[PDB]
Amino acid sequence: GMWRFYTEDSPGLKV
């Protein structure tokens, strides 16, 4: 289906 991001970005980031 549609693409929506590169898997090494992971837009929700909170460490």
Partner 1 sequence: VRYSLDPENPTKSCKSRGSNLRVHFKNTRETAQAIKGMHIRKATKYLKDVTLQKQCVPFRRYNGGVGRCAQAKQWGWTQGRWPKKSAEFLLHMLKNAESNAELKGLDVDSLVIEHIQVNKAPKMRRRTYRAHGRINPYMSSPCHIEMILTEKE
Partner RNA sequence: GCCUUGAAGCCUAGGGCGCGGGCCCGGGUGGAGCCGCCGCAGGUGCAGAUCUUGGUGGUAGUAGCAAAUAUUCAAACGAGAACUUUGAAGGCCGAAGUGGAGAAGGGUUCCAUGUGAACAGCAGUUGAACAUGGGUCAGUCGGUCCUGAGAGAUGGGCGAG
Partner RNA sequence: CCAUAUCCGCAGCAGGUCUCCAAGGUGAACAGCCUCUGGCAUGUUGGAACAAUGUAGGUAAGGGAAGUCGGCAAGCCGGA
Partner RNA sequence: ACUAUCCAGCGAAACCACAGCCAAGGGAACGGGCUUGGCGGAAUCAGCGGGGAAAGAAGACCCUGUUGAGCUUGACUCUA
Partner RNA sequence: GAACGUGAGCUGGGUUUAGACCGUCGUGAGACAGGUUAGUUUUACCCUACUGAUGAUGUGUUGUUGCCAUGGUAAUCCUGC
CB 9 within 8 A of CB 3: no
What is the contact mask toward RNA in residues 1 to 15, using x (rule: CB under 7 A)?
A: xx-xxx-xxxxxxxx
User: Length of the chain in residues, anyone?
Assistant: 15
> What residues numbered 1-15 form the site for partner 1, per CB under 8 A?
1-3
Q: How far is CA 14 from the centre of its chain?
A: 13
Residues 6+ apart with CB under 8 A from 5: 11
Number of residues that bind partner 1 (CB under 8 A): 3
CB of 11 to RNA, least distance (A): 4
Interacting residues with RNA (CB under 7 A): 1-2, 4-6, 8-15
